[PDB]
Design goal:
The structure is cut from a larger assembly and holds four copies of chain A. Chain A is an alpha+beta fold. The first copy, chain A, has a five-stranded mixed β-sheet with strand order 1-19-13-2-3, sandwiched between helices. Chain A has a five-stranded antiparallel β-sheet with strand order 7-10-9-8-11, with no helix packed on it. The first copy, chain A, folds into three domains: 79 residues, no CATH class; 126 residues, no CATH class; 113 residues, no CATH class. The interface between A and D is medium-sized, with 28 and 25 residues. Chain C: It is found in: Virion. Chain C: This is Major capsid protein.
C-alpha cells in the first residue's frame, strides 16, 4: 500500500512543479456566485487559445478544499434540477465541467509555499535558440532537450524549485498562427543552479529577435525577447494548495524489470510482487545470515515519472491576493 | 567497477509529441470561386461585379 | 511502513513497530429505593417504578 | 496546416477592418444578466431593420474571452434547464442564440486599438451620388466602386485604417 502510494506523490509533484500554465485569481474560490465555474472554464480558455493539442483528452484535479467550494457554489442555487440535487446528496460536482471531460478530487496535490523573492531582475539580453543537437568538445554531436532553458538573473535568493514567474512585458503566442495573446507568459522554475542562474522549463524563443533563422523563428512561442532591465514577477504570493490540469498525454510513467530471478543470484529467494492498484510490478526477495540468525526482506520497485509537455501541464492558484 | 561496454543513444522515430491542434472556423463560411484565368491576367487581377438593382 | 530509494541499501535495514489502543470500563449506574411493609398492600406503585427505572 | 491557417488570419482582419455595423456596449460583457444575449440579439435586430439580405444565412463569431463570458453569464442563473446545464458540463453556448444560423468561437479575431482623434468636424457640405462611373482627364469613362467614399474633415490625426 505504501509503495503504490509513492507513485501518486511523484506524479502530483512532477505536475505541480513543471506546470507552465498558471491561473492566478485575486480572490478566494467560491466568493462569488459562479466563480467556481469561471475558474475551471478559465483553464479551457488558455488551453484553447494557446493552441495546444487535447486530442487524447484533458483532465482537471481539485484539491479537497476547492472541491467543496465548487460543490458549495452549486448548492446556493435553487435545489431543483439534477445538478444541484446531486451535489446536495453527495459533494459531487459533475464529471465534466466547462469542457474538461474529467474532474476529480486528488487529496495529494502539494501546497505551493510563499516565495520570498523580491526585486529580482534579469541581467543582459538573452536569446534562446531552438536546436536539435549541438557540438561538444572533440566535435561530437550531442542531442539537446527542447524544454529547459537557463536564465541569468540579478540575484537568486528566495526563489526555489516550482516557483511560478512571469517576466514583465512578455506575452503568449498562439503557437500555430503566432498571434499575440492577452495573458502574460508564465514559467515555472524547475531548478536553481546558483545564486544567479535559474532554469525555467519552457524555452521562450522570442518572435521579434533577429538572431533566429527562419527555421527557428517558426517555433517562437513568446512575442519579445528578455531585455536587460526586465523585472521578474513572482506569481505565487499567499500559500494555497494547488489545482492541477493537463492533457492526458503530457505525463508518462516509465518502468523496467529487475532481473533478480537470474541464475547469478543463488542465495536469496525472489518472487514477483505486485503492488495493489497502480499497475506497476515489483519483486520480492529474502535472504538469511547464519552469523546473526537475522534474515533480510526486501521489496523493490523501479520506475520513473516524466512530464513530456510542461507547457500542457498547468496549475491553478486560487486566492492569490497580495 | 560495473559492466563497461558500448554505449547507445537511441531515438524512437515513431512516437512524436503531437503538440499542436489547429482550428479554422471562418474559412468554411467565406465563399470560394475561381474567376476565368485568361481574362484575369490582362486585368489588374480585378473584376467588377454588378449590384442588385433598385 | 517507511520506504527508501537506492541500489546499495547495506546497513540501512529497518526494524518494526506497531501500536496499541486500550478500551477501558467505567463505574456502574444504579437505581436504589426502599419501601415500608405497609406500602406493599398494592403493588401498583411498586411495579411502576421498576418500569420508570428501565 | 500552416498555409491553410494563414488564410484564416486574413479573413479575421479583413472583416474587422471593413465592418460597417457597429454595436458598442458601455460595460464589459457578462456583467449583467442578459447582456450576452442582448449583445448578440442587437446584431440580428439591426440587419433586420436595415433590410439586408441574409437569405444565404448569417453567422456570429465570439473571441475566446467573450465566449467564456457568454457561458459565465448563463451559468449564474439559479435554475438549470437543458440550456443552462449544457453550458455547465461543457462551455457550449447554444448554436443559435437569437436568430443567427450558427454561433462559433474563433480564436484569431484581432483586437481593435483605440484612436486618439478628438475635435473633428467635417469641411463644408458634402454629397455623394450613386454613380456607376465618372469622367476623368481625357474623358474616358472609368468605373467607380460603390462601396468607398471620400470625406474631407477638419483634420486627420490619430485616425487609422
Amino acid at each position: 500500500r505504501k509503495l503504490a502510494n509513492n507513485v501518486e506523490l511523484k506524479v502530483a509533484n512532477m505536475a505541480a512543479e513543471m506546470g507552465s500554465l498558471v491561473i492566478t485569481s485575486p480572490d478566494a474560490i467560491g466568493t462569488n456566485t459562479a466563480d467556481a465555474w469561471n475558474f475551471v472554464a478559465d483553464a479551457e480558455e488558455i488551453m484553447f487559445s494557446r493552441e495546444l493539442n487535447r486530442d487524447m483528452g484533458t483532465s482537471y484535479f481539485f484539491n479537497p478544499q476547492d472541491y467543496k467550494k465548487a460543490g458549495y457554489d452549486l448548492t446556493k442555487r435553487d435545489i431543483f434540477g439534477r445538478i444541484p440535487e446531486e451535489a446536495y446528496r453527495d459533494g459531487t460536482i459533475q464529471r465534466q465541467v466547462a469542457g474538461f471531460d474529467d474532474v476529480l478530487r486528488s487529496p495529494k496535490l502539494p501546497v505551493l509555499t510563499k516565495s520570498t523573492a523580491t526585486g529580482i531582475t534579469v541581467s543582459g539580453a538573452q536569446s534562446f535558440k531552438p536546436v536539435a543537437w549541438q557540438l561538444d568538445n572533440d566535435g561530437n554531436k550531442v542531442n539537446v532537450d527542447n524544454r529547459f532553458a537557463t536564465v541569468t538573473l540579478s540575484a537568486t535568493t528566495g526563489m526555489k524549485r516550482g516557483d511560478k514567474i512571469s517576466f514583465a512585458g512578455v506575452k503568449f503566442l498562439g503557437q500555430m498562427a503566432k498571434n499575440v495573446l492577452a495573458q502574460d507568459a508564465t514559467f515555472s522554475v524547475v531548478r536553481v543552479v546558483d545564486g544567479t542562474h535559474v532554469e525555467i522549463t519552457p524555452k521562450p524563443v522570442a518572435l521579434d529577435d533577429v538572431s533566429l533563422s527562419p527555421e527557428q523563428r517558426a517555433y517562437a512561442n513568446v512575442n519579445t525577447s528578455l531585455a536587460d532591465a526586465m523585472a521578474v514577477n513572482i506569481l505565487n504570493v499567499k500559500d494555497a494548495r494547488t489545482n492541477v490540469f493537463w492533457a492526458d498525454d503530457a505525463i508518462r510513467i516509465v518502468s523496467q524489470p529487475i532481473p533478480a530471478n537470474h541464475e547469478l543470484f543463488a542465495g536469496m529467494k525472489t518472487t514477483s510482487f505486485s503492488i495493489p492498484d497502480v499497475g506497476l510490478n515489483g519483486i520480492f526477495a529474502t535472504q538469511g545470515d547464519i552469523s546473526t540468525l537475522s534474515g533480510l526482506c526486501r521489496i523493490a520497485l523501479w520506475y520513473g515519472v516524466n512530464a513530456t509537455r510542461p507547457e500542457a501541464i498547468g496549475v491553478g492558484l486560487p486566492g492569490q491576493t497580495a | 567497477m560495473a559492466l563497461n561496454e558500448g554505449q547507445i543513444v537511441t531515438l524512437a522515430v515513431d512516437e512524436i509529441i503531437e503538440t499542436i491542434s489547429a482550428i479554422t472556423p471562418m474559412a468554411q463560411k467565406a465563399k470560394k470561386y475561381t474567376p476565368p484565368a485568361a481574362s484575369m491576367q490582362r486585368s489588374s487581377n480585378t473584376i467588377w461585379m454588378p449590384v442588385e438593382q433598385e | 511502513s517507511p520506504t527508501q530509494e537506492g541500489w546499495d541499501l547495506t546497513d540501512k535495514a529497518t526494524g518494526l513497530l506497531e501500536l496499541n489502543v486500550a478500551v477501558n470500563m467505567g463505574e456502574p449506574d444504579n437505581d436504589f429505593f426502599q419501601l415500608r411493609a405497609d406500602d406493599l398492600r398494592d403493588e401498583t406503585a411498586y411495579r411502576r417504578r421498576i418500569q420508570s427505572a428501565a
